[PDB]
Amino acid sequence: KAVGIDLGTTNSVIAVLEGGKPVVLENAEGERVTPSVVAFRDGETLVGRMAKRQAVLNPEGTIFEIKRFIGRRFEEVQEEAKRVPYKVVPGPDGGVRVEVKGKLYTPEEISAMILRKLVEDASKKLGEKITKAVITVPAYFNNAQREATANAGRIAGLEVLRIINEPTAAALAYGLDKKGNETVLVFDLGGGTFDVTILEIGEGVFEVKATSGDTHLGGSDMDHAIVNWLAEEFKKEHGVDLKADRQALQRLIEAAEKAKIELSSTLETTISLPFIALDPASKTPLHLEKKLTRAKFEELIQPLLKRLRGPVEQALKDAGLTPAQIDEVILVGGATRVPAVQQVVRELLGKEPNRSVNPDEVVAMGAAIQAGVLMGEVRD
Amino acid sequence: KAVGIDLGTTNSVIAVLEGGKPVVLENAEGERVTPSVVAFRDGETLVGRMAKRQAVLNPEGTIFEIKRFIGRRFEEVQEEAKRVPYKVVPGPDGGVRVEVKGKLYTPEEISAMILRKLVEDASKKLGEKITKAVITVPAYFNNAQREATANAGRIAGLEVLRIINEPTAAALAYGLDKKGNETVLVFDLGGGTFDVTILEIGEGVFEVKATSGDTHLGGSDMDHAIVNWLAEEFKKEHGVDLKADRQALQRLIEAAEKAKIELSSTLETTISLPFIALDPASKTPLHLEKKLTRAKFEELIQPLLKRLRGPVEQALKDAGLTPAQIDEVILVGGATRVPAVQQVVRELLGKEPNRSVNPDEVVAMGAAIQAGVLMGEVRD
Amino acid sequence: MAKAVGIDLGTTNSVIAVLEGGKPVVLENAEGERVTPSVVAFRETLVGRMAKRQAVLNPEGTIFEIKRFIGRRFEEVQEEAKRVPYKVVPGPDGGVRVEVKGKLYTPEEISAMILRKLVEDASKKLGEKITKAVITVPAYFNNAQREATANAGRIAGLEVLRIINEPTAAALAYGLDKKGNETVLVFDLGGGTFDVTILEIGEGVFEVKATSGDTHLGGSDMDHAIVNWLAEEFKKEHGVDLKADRQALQRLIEAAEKAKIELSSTLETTISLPFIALDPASKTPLHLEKKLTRAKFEELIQPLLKRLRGPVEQALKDAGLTPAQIDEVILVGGATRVPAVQQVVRELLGKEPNRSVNPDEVVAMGAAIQAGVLMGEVRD
Amino acid sequence: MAKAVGIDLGTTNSVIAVLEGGKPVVLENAEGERVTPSVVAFRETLVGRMAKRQAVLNPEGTIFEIKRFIGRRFEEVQEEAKRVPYKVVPGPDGGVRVEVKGKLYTPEEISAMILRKLVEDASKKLGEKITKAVITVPAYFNNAQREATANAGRIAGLEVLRIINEPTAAALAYGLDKKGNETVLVFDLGGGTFDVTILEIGEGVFEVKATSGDTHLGGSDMDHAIVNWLAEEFKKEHGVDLKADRQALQRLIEAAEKAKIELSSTLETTISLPFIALDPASKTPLHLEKKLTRAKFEELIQPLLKRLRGPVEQALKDAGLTPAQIDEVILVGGATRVPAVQQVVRELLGKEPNRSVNPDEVVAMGAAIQAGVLMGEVRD
């Protein structure tokens, strides 16, 4: 049975066409998403959550957001390499390599580790071996990036059936290929990137009409906003700068994202990090305990919300379209669950956005739809 | 652009996937159906209505219902040949041949004439040349009959894409491939044949579960019922037996079917055949003028309506199904328009039958759907 | 406990339908017809086909096209009163009355009579008395005219569940509500009116962008074009002016419409009116018998076709839309069956019209769907 | 002029939703939550989360699960009255009252209070006061219980447009009404009840073939299984019986539910209750801190899973159906999010459940659709 795979910059999702319906599969960690993170520690290499859970402690051996480099040449990525803590070096071909303890990997090899783990754990969950997949890529990827992604799947031991666009995969998952003439604005906000795509769906041609976005705007920026708030409140209370202790900083990142997620369903939550630091005078343990209201959370992220408007406006103008001429706005990415993002979408386009399908599963589901179709299997 | 073609035993229909929607095309005679009739007269051969309009006058050179012979061996068809007025002879292979004035044609060659005329007139209507088609056949046809039909299309100059089942084509045209799990009873009543098919639509497999029918039950039997009524009423009034004059009989067949069709939309109609015969005593012209009520029409056809039940009951039993277990009954064939047939269907299965699509166009539309799909074109 | 129905109260014909087994079914009347002429005649009182069959004979006791005056004040339909053979006088209020032999009636009372026959005859097909209905009205009707139509239903003995637009009930029958956002041009040509409606179906609503049309362009005008031709050709061949005889004119009108309906599906038909007039010199009977081809029919109705351009170009201009910006064109009204009309749409809009559903039943079918859904029924 | 809403009045939680832009939107309450606990507490009067957060502290002024008594007579719920901490006395009629500090209330009045908060808080998201609603009830409710639920809405100040079955509103949200005939098993597991419903959606109706379930099997029982484990482990490690302290028991209940929700998407979570009790010898504080794995969670809740077999096998037997004869199994209720539950369905029915829509919002979403359609709105 063929599967769909969302090779995302932050998380990856696998799904399979089961009985005409896409089903997302759990990983070994019991989670429907696998972080796109590989950790090279002194021992067995870590891939997934266990890698992301130690990324602050192991900056030299943890490779994250490798998707920003896959398929590009170094002269084009010099700046983004200055923004990463791991070593990014050019290859014999002008390519990109990651150097850990002197060893050298390609972004296709790093990506292939994430893909292999997804297929391994999914094959266990399904009780059959998975060898054929459809992998998705951002609409703005070129042939080099599409082939490099296809290579990453082959290296992981997969027969790659097709490399399709993420926004198309989303439209497939929402079934907008079955509603005649649709003009779809895909509003993709994920871990680190923001992506606006305008699709002219009609007579079966998914014609991309405009792209825009923000390559450094995502849910992790909301996370850091909480982190800086929590550390400032702790320096003021105890004179301890938790951002200087990699162990305390790693728990702040972990606790911040958890509180943000809880605040997508409720008005107030409490961050509690016991034994976070030692009191400088008495050397006794210190426990962080703060309550974050959604109201404060939204004040902290407002500059991120205000930057959503630009890409949306530019994509409309680049396509010659009015908010009124958009026939459907679909929400993609785990970060569109923030109620404030949803309101921002309403205010930007004057329409109620489709939120039927899980936003962090919609790509993987559409990709699995494509897969089953290429293999004869149908939909409902 | 690929087309669908219903090579029917009485009429043939052509249709094309236009803008995601099947459109049936008119022939040279401005009619959405072309009779499956070829006439070999002393001159240019007649194919279509002009052939059917002279079939009583030219019994030796008019070939009708050739579909009953296509792809079968003579030893299997000896009896049906005794039922036709034209010569049916075996070939060097045990096949079937039609002999007109000593010349010899195959049912594939006769059929190819009907198909060629359909493509010729349709190519004029569309302004582009038509070379690729999907042709349909009864579900009970074997490989010999499917290949012979495919041959008839190739002989007509067509690239045959696929030979699919008529009931599947109907289900396609009704869109029942887009309603998950459907158990469909196809109720096909056409010119001369009655066909009941049970389709297990589910997960994309159109599994035929049962077939039954009546190879000599159709709309022409209703026509003859009117004819015998009109001739008896005319013998009683004038001592003239209009069935003995091929010219008067040809007008009775033509006028009978027209009155039947009018009585599908209204309660009463008038058959008026002026100058039909000469008065035996005075040699002056005689004019037939009778009014047929739908009530009388239904009395005349009741034995045809009562024979509908058998095949339906046998197909349910052959499939192990109850009327309640049928998920949908679709009406196929120009003859299911008779309000009495529709009531008979309600009473047989206890369900309201789907009559959305034109019953004499539903096959050709589904076939054109199949065609466009094999060629990438989509639906709405 | 009873089944609610939908009713198209049209200017020329009225149609009733119900939703049986999730299926929209148009019901026949006592005369076995799926359309009931919107005509009332006082001779006994006549309502429907019988009233239409003697409309030329009884020019002042026959009320027809009452929909032009319903809900309107006399001071605004004064010029339309001068165009009808029956008496139209203002009431004590600014309203509109029709005077027949001193007896006064209102547009509501006249309409209510058409409705009562529909419910009475339909109640006998279903086996139970219909009490609730959904009645349709032109999109351009005001609240006064919508109030009046609902009143005519209450007089008839109906509970009016809702008064919805005819262009909306058409899109319902065609399922456009299940295709996200669709821009739809509704091409409505009936017995005597031409109506163009542009809809944007989406965001929960049927947004009317533009309305256009011709109040005196319809299928009846094509009828008169055939009548005038037959009358002149008989003038030319026998020196008798049939249009001066109410008995012959009545037969011509009846026959012209039938020839038209036949020339929708065939290239040639024959009009036969035996004993239509007497020779002025010989006092001997004369029989009309003329064959009419579609080509002649289409040359007689050509001036009528030329008037279809204007309203379509005005609504597009009134909406800011291009024929390419129309997603779907649906065909409504008995006149849209004429092939020359469908061709005119093809040329004005560049796309093939939707004729999947009977143009004279599609509106009543939507209203049937709107009644079932308000009664907790759903479409199968 | 206003927007009508749909409301799930559930045994444990209540959900409100509306149909904005043809889209079903669940609305948050004043506490920013998409579910409002069906609890009322008199201390001031408390309704919702605040009433649930002090339910262990105020055992006799807190009314919960009032849906067990609504519409029912006292002589029939006598044994269910003995199972609750608050007073349940018979009224002057055979009805049911709850006595709190001498003050009497009815199930309708208690329910009406839950409803009033939903409409009040939702009216502030929409900007207009909601006056019309569609409220859902279990398929097994009688007219008395359906009457009572509508009365509770009228007390709340609502016009009850209709009282529809929860299993029908679920199929609406899942669009099963647009798939011809579907046999659907609705697996409903909520806070405290288990409900199995077999539907045959077709022929215009939602035919209930079988109803089954467990009145005391739900998500709350999984909560108590976690509470009892924490209480015994604390007994074992500190010799303090937290279940004897209403203040600690209240915190345990609150924390056990949160750990459960986290173990729906992860393999391991930690419960942390600082300052939960005092040492009996030292009078020094004690902090609970236990990590709970899904595997332990799934072993604690295993007896609850075993009880899911019975009702499913009884409804299949009560319908004459085979797991293979079920076309679709849809997942409803907050408890169906537990992975062990979805696995149990996979095994009992042999097919993957539909979890495309949030199991705790799907019913309110259908009711939202049923309100928009009765108000002339349609789904985008």
Ligand SMILES: Nc1ncnc2c1ncn2[C@@H]1O[C@H](COP(=O)(O)OP(=O)(O)O)[C@@H](O)[C@H]1O
């Ligand atoms: N319920 C939620 N509420 C708010 N943010 C969420 C929620 N779930 C996930 N996110 C955030 O969304 C992001 C994950 O989105 P995803 O589509 O998986 O990323 P990517 O496409 O960048 O690989 C993370 O920043 C995560 O914190």
Ligand SMILES: Nc1ncnc2c1ncn2[C@@H]1O[C@H](COP(=O)(O)OP(=O)(O)O)[C@@H](O)[C@H]1O
């Ligand atoms: N409106 C109608 N009412 C009744 N019978 C009709 C009507 N239209 C066509 N028929 C009859 O239906 C038959 C044509 O059906 P068709 O499906 O074209 O035939 P076949 O499948 O046998 O080639 C003829 O007997 C014709 O008289």
Ligand SMILES: Nc1ncnc2c1ncn2[C@@H]1O[C@H](COP(=O)(O)OP(=O)(O)O)[C@@H](O)[C@H]1O
């Ligand atoms: N099959 C047909 N072919 C041609 N014209 C037709 C056909 N059926 C109906 N018409 C014409 O359409 C008109 C009736 O249209 P209809 O929708 O019933 O009217 P209205 O909506 O104006 O009340 C008549 O003039 C009739 O002659």
Ligand SMILES: Nc1ncnc2c1ncn2[C@@H]1O[C@H](COP(=O)(O)OP(=O)(O)O)[C@@H](O)[C@H]1O
């Ligand atoms: N994500 C989740 N994971 C696990 N259990 C959950 C989740 N969400 C809700 N539940 C549980 O489901 C129950 C609520 O279900 P719900 O449908 O709201 O209740 P009801 O229909 O009985 O009023 C609670 O016991 C809650 O703990």
Ligand SMILES: [Ca+2]
């Ligand atoms: Ca399925």
Ligand SMILES: [Ca+2]
């Ligand atoms: Ca659309």
Ligand SMILES: [Ca+2]
């Ligand atoms: Ca628009």
Ligand SMILES: [Ca+2]
């Ligand atoms: Ca559009």
Ligand SMILES: [Ca+2]
């Ligand atoms: Ca839309």
Ligand SMILES: [Ca+2]
């Ligand atoms: Ca189209």
Ligand SMILES: [Ca+2]
């Ligand atoms: Ca189905």
Ligand SMILES: [Ca+2]
């Ligand atoms: Ca059934």
Ligand SMILES: [Ca+2]
């Ligand atoms: Ca079934």
Ligand SMILES: [Ca+2]
């Ligand atoms: Ca059905």
Ligand SMILES: [Mg+2]
């Ligand atoms: Mg993503």
Ligand SMILES: [Mg+2]
């Ligand atoms: Mg046929």
